[PDB]
């Protein structure tokens, strides 16, 4: 069973 | 949310599935398009993608979310590229799609194009996301 | 005197 | 922070100056290339760039960091365009440089080309950055 994922960095802007 | 990343990859309408999978320690799909195939990726599938044996899938094929694929180009483990291209296996006459898996420090970016979408297009989209992740040390 | 600028959004690919 | 945007705009070597300027409420240079012209932009100059009067700078021109310029095309406030093209005022026979300033919701992006670089090249460079910002609600 996996641990919760790390906090993601800001994603790129939308198209 | 890691999900905000899936919206990004699905925004222009060229792809039908996308996924961010963590492959270290205890593999897991961090984010995916609900109800499709990538969501169903198992640690076993992640195992062969990053496995050290990069020749056995060229003979028996590959599977993602239980969907049979054929490897066409493997540079997943090669620095500067970290990308692997694939094609789904026509479900009896059915249409096949192009898939591209890119690998970063801690994730696997997967993308599946819609019917008839240039695989090189799918590749670039994928490749640019992984680069964005690598820039933030992910 | 201006206030400090707000934090910027992620820049575009190098 | 904002200084990283200057690095992006200066990366290819075609431009010699660049600046990100915040123009609302209390005008300020958020980031600029050190020791150049734009780094010395004043709130008064930002006032003219985005002021209501869009005809007076055509007769006497304007300055940027104290550098006199002539306005060529002005679509700064025009929706869909948000760009203004200029050219430095030749100190006698001295070389002139093409400048383009684009406007986002919170910033002004300025770009000055090196001698002889096409003004339309400098314009796209600028316009693409403003677009990145805009799409990031900035
Ligand atoms: C919970 O996710 C346990 C688990 C681990 C750690 C695992 C590691 C590596 C491979 O290849 C498969 C795994 O399946 C698991 O259920
Ligand atoms: C500090 O920056 C005070 C200041 C303000 C608020 C200002 C607003 C608008 C214009 O056109 C000029 C300004 O100069 C200032 O010094």
XYZ file of C-alpha atoms and ligand atoms in Angstrom:
337
model
C 0.000 0.000 0.000
C 1.519 3.350 -1.034
C 2.004 6.463 1.103
C 0.227 9.671 0.084
C 1.944 11.456 -2.859
C 4.207 14.467 -2.328
C 2.780 17.973 -2.809
C 2.954 18.816 -6.528
C 4.700 21.985 -7.698
C 2.627 24.628 -9.571
C 1.448 23.235 -12.938
C 1.976 25.021 -16.262
C -0.699 27.523 -17.376
C -3.674 26.326 -19.450
C -3.663 26.625 -23.278
C -3.602 18.589 -6.601
C -1.709 16.287 -8.956
C -5.033 16.189 -10.819
C -4.598 19.755 -11.987
C -1.872 18.266 -14.141
C -4.294 15.932 -15.934
C -6.579 18.812 -16.840
C -3.598 20.548 -18.383
C -2.711 17.539 -20.521
C -6.330 17.031 -21.547
C -7.135 20.658 -22.258
C -6.542 20.876 -26.030
C -8.617 17.816 -26.827
C -5.975 15.875 -28.728
C -5.655 13.124 -26.074
C -8.102 10.679 -24.505
C -6.107 9.638 -21.425
C -3.255 10.931 -19.276
C -1.601 9.906 -16.025
C 1.045 10.815 -13.451
C 2.443 7.757 -11.680
C 4.944 7.641 -8.820
C 7.353 4.785 -9.538
C 9.669 4.770 -6.517
C 9.311 2.543 -3.441
C 5.650 1.657 -3.690
C 4.453 2.479 -7.238
C 1.105 4.230 -7.543
C -0.994 6.301 -9.929
C -0.868 9.798 -8.444
C -3.406 11.144 -10.951
C -5.312 9.961 -13.997
C -8.381 10.503 -16.185
C -11.317 8.836 -14.374
C -12.907 5.798 -15.981
C -10.263 5.241 -18.632
C -7.384 2.750 -18.743
C -4.364 4.494 -17.264
C -6.164 4.765 -13.900
C -5.905 0.965 -13.759
C -2.119 0.811 -13.898
C -0.687 -1.711 -11.440
C 2.771 -1.682 -9.789
C 3.590 -4.728 -11.947
C 3.200 -2.641 -15.114
C 5.254 0.191 -13.666
C 7.828 -2.478 -12.864
C 8.513 -3.442 -16.478
C 8.377 0.160 -17.716
C 11.333 1.106 -15.502
C 12.692 -2.422 -15.262
C 16.367 -3.035 -16.039
C 15.433 -5.658 -18.644
C 14.634 -3.528 -21.695
C 14.386 -6.370 -24.200
C 11.684 -8.771 -23.052
C 8.810 -6.366 -23.795
C 10.044 -6.119 -27.380
C 9.188 -9.818 -27.647
C 6.034 -10.326 -25.577
C 4.765 -6.752 -25.631
C 3.609 -4.521 -22.798
C 0.447 -3.802 -20.803
C -0.917 -0.575 -19.284
C -4.084 -0.571 -17.231
C -4.382 -4.074 -18.625
C -4.242 -2.724 -22.166
C -1.800 -4.470 -24.477
C 0.768 -2.193 -26.134
C 3.766 -2.580 -28.453
C 7.013 -0.786 -27.733
C 8.248 1.250 -30.668
C 10.940 3.470 -29.149
C 12.582 3.064 -25.750
C 14.746 5.891 -24.385
C 13.044 5.976 -21.011
C 16.274 5.432 -19.175
C 18.388 7.494 -21.544
C 19.249 10.936 -20.171
C 18.273 13.911 -22.307
C 15.293 11.946 -23.606
C 13.668 9.843 -20.879
C 10.847 8.987 -23.262
C 9.355 5.783 -24.590
C 6.798 5.620 -27.387
C 4.164 2.895 -27.820
C 1.075 1.935 -29.762
C -1.973 0.175 -28.347
C -2.776 -3.298 -29.681
C -5.821 -3.225 -31.968
C -8.620 -4.990 -30.109
C -9.508 -7.190 -33.054
C -9.639 -4.816 -36.014
C -10.333 -1.907 -33.644
C -8.235 1.303 -33.895
C -4.882 1.573 -32.140
C -3.620 4.735 -30.447
C -0.248 6.285 -29.777
C 1.030 6.434 -26.223
C 4.111 8.095 -24.793
C 5.587 7.512 -21.346
C 8.120 10.035 -20.046
C 10.075 9.611 -16.813
C 11.175 12.265 -14.334
C 12.931 12.127 -10.937
C 9.909 10.694 -9.147
C 7.138 10.262 -11.723
C 6.067 8.688 -14.985
C 4.063 10.971 -17.309
C 1.738 8.935 -19.560
C -0.377 10.174 -22.463
C -2.644 8.495 -25.009
C -3.748 10.314 -28.160
C -7.155 10.131 -29.828
C -7.685 8.135 -33.045
C -5.411 9.375 -35.831
C -3.373 11.858 -33.784
C 0.248 12.087 -34.823
C 2.341 10.152 -32.308
C 5.047 12.789 -32.500
C 2.453 15.283 -31.303
C 1.585 13.056 -28.328
C 5.331 12.759 -27.706
C 6.043 16.492 -27.528
C 3.149 17.174 -25.161
C 4.409 14.433 -22.898
C 8.054 15.459 -23.153
C 7.299 19.070 -22.186
C 5.428 18.077 -19.047
C 8.266 15.914 -17.775
C 10.661 18.819 -18.409
C 8.400 21.079 -16.313
C 8.493 18.465 -13.554
C 12.270 18.033 -13.812
C 12.801 21.799 -13.536
C 11.128 21.714 -10.079
C 13.184 18.647 -9.101
C 10.283 16.244 -9.492
C 6.792 53.873 -2.342
C 5.617 50.652 -3.985
C 4.744 47.498 -2.075
C 6.776 44.349 -2.722
C 5.807 42.593 -5.982
C 3.555 39.563 -5.669
C 5.149 36.122 -6.161
C 5.424 35.272 -9.866
C 3.766 32.357 -11.627
C 5.940 29.531 -12.988
C 7.919 30.951 -15.927
C 7.806 29.457 -19.435
C 10.148 26.708 -20.668
C 13.756 28.018 -20.725
C 11.610 35.336 -8.694
C 10.510 37.810 -11.371
C 14.207 38.057 -12.263
C 13.931 34.615 -13.834
C 11.687 36.058 -16.544
C 14.461 38.422 -17.582
C 16.686 35.387 -18.004
C 14.095 33.763 -20.263
C 13.743 36.873 -22.471
C 17.490 37.333 -22.712
C 18.345 33.673 -23.330
C 18.666 33.769 -27.135
C 20.901 36.814 -27.419
C 18.745 38.861 -29.782
C 17.715 41.437 -27.125
C 19.836 43.765 -24.977
C 17.309 44.832 -22.348
C 14.072 43.614 -20.866
C 11.861 44.466 -17.920
C 8.742 43.352 -16.085
C 6.867 46.359 -14.700
C 3.869 46.491 -12.385
C 1.681 49.418 -13.415
C -1.337 49.365 -11.100
C -1.673 51.640 -8.069
C 2.036 52.081 -7.387
C 4.136 51.634 -10.571
C 7.332 49.652 -10.117
C 10.096 47.796 -11.868
C 9.602 44.236 -10.655
C 12.624 42.972 -12.607
C 14.986 44.374 -15.221
C 18.423 43.760 -16.692
C 20.941 45.370 -14.309
C 22.755 48.536 -15.323
C 20.761 49.133 -18.483
C 17.931 51.510 -19.499
C 14.603 49.933 -18.481
C 15.902 49.341 -14.990
C 15.464 53.110 -14.594
C 11.808 53.365 -15.635
C 9.804 55.780 -13.461
C 6.143 55.735 -12.356
C 5.638 58.880 -14.440
C 6.744 57.004 -17.576
C 4.491 54.079 -16.778
C 1.818 56.723 -16.479
C 2.262 57.774 -20.108
C 2.499 54.194 -21.387
C -0.917 53.333 -19.992
C -2.407 56.794 -19.518
C -5.731 57.842 -21.034
C -4.168 60.325 -23.433
C -3.054 58.213 -26.393
C -2.298 61.034 -28.809
C 0.161 63.347 -27.126
C 3.126 60.978 -27.263
C 2.824 61.034 -31.048
C 3.810 64.702 -31.131
C 6.578 64.872 -28.533
C 7.141 61.141 -28.080
C 7.984 59.503 -24.764
C 10.866 58.256 -22.649
C 11.695 54.912 -21.087
C 14.331 55.038 -18.395
C 14.979 58.541 -19.698
C 15.493 57.235 -23.227
C 13.488 59.166 -25.817
C 11.437 56.971 -28.137
C 8.943 57.440 -30.959
C 5.680 55.482 -30.960
C 4.982 53.518 -34.133
C 2.081 51.177 -33.481
C -0.062 51.514 -30.350
C -2.503 48.735 -29.514
C -1.571 48.662 -25.825
C -5.115 49.024 -24.572
C -6.730 47.379 -27.590
C -8.082 43.993 -26.547
C -6.474 41.013 -28.242
C -3.441 43.153 -29.075
C -2.118 44.674 -25.830
C 1.064 45.744 -27.581
C 2.870 48.952 -28.452
C 5.850 49.136 -30.796
C 8.503 51.841 -30.574
C 11.974 52.827 -31.687
C 14.609 54.661 -29.680
C 15.352 58.235 -30.783
C 18.735 58.295 -32.524
C 21.211 60.500 -30.690
C 22.192 62.152 -33.956
C 23.422 59.420 -36.259
C 23.577 56.922 -33.403
C 21.826 53.542 -33.928
C 18.142 53.162 -33.073
C 16.706 50.054 -31.470
C 13.294 48.473 -31.767
C 11.250 48.292 -28.570
C 7.925 46.584 -27.856
C 5.944 46.789 -24.624
C 3.025 44.430 -23.986
C 0.392 44.708 -21.257
C -1.050 42.033 -18.977
C -3.537 42.380 -16.114
C -0.869 43.342 -13.594
C 2.287 43.946 -15.604
C 3.985 45.621 -18.521
C 6.605 43.610 -20.420
C 9.292 45.623 -22.197
C 11.857 44.442 -24.724
C 14.648 46.201 -26.572
C 16.382 44.516 -29.504
C 20.068 44.686 -30.328
C 21.096 46.835 -33.290
C 19.585 45.621 -36.569
C 17.281 42.982 -35.122
C 13.882 42.914 -36.763
C 11.205 44.792 -34.857
C 8.726 42.044 -35.680
C 11.038 39.525 -33.987
C 11.185 41.647 -30.808
C 7.392 42.047 -31.008
C 6.656 38.306 -30.999
C 9.148 37.653 -28.208
C 7.363 40.192 -26.031
C 3.856 39.219 -27.089
C 4.415 35.579 -26.217
C 5.524 36.399 -22.674
C 2.556 38.680 -22.036
C 0.377 35.789 -23.190
C 2.018 33.368 -20.747
C 1.398 35.847 -17.953
C -2.137 36.620 -19.032
C -3.051 32.911 -19.130
C -1.654 32.712 -15.571
C -4.115 35.468 -14.596
C -1.225 37.889 -14.210
C 1.680 -1.455 -1.174
O 1.608 -0.733 -2.176
C 2.629 -2.677 -1.118
C 3.304 -3.032 -2.481
C 4.593 -2.682 -2.757
C 5.454 -1.896 -1.725
C 5.212 -3.082 -4.125
C 6.562 -2.731 -4.448
C 7.118 -3.110 -5.698
C 6.330 -3.838 -6.629
O 6.879 -4.237 -7.911
C 5.000 -4.183 -6.316
C 4.427 -3.815 -5.078
O 3.032 -4.206 -4.827
C 2.482 -3.809 -3.535
O 1.330 -4.113 -3.285
C 5.412 55.362 -3.843
O 5.680 54.660 -4.833
C 4.497 56.591 -3.953
C 4.124 56.976 -5.411
C 2.928 56.623 -5.954
C 1.885 55.802 -5.139
C 2.599 57.049 -7.408
C 1.348 56.692 -8.003
C 1.044 57.093 -9.340
C 1.980 57.849 -10.079
O 1.666 58.255 -11.427
C 3.227 58.206 -9.496
C 3.548 57.811 -8.165
O 4.854 58.204 -7.615
C 5.136 57.783 -6.246
O 6.213 58.088 -5.752
